[PDB]
């Protein structure tokens, strides 16, 4: 079940993208800046329990462990394993490169 399915595609309901999630996984600085874009006191569990791969905060460690057992987390696993779609992949699809001399 998805909460408020009719306005899920609104811009104010937009979620973090998979390429951003890959950048957070590869570099801790990107994840850090995404965390100063949020208030720590307003997060579940004081922001101490967080899934980078699903980009979601949880109330407890047992909640995070229960999350790691489910299907949305495993779909995020398989999507990250396949790899997110990026601008370089978009250019390689049409066979376009950048000449920097």
């Amino acid at each position: 079940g998805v909460f408020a399915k009719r306005t899920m595609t609104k811009t104010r309901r937009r979620l973090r993208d998979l390429d951003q999630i890959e950048r957070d996984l590869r570099s801790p600085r990107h994840l850090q800046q995404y965390k100063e874009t949020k208030a720590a006191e307003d997060l579940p569990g004081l922001g101490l329990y967080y899934c980078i791969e699903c980009a979601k905060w949880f109330e407890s460690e047992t909640s995070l462990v229960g999350h790691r057992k489910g299907k949305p987390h495993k779909r995020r696993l398989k999507q990250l394993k396949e790899g997110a779609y990026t601008h370089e992949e978009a250019m390689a699809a049409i066979g376009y490169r950048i000449d920097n001399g």
Binding site: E41, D42, L43, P44, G45, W57, E59
Partner: protein, 64 residues
């Protein structure tokens, strides 16, 4: 007085009013959507208790 507030709410250890309201919200379940504490509602509860006398307080008389 601090001990009266701690006895009233069974709650202690805050450093300021913001942390006091936050831990009171987490204890009483006054949470918004997404696990965010309801500091406004908890502050309204505290003010209601203050003016309704659930929280003991007084103004000391001037010394002669």
């Amino acid at each position: 007085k601090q001990h009266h507030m701690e006895r009233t709410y069974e709650l202690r250890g805050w450093k300021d009013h913001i942390e006091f309201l936050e831990m009171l919200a987490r204890k009483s379940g006054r949470l918004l959507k997404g696990g965010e504490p309801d500091v406004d509602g908890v502050a309204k509860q505290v003010l209601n208790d203050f003016m309704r006398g659930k929280i003991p307080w007084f103004t000391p008389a001037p010394e002669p």
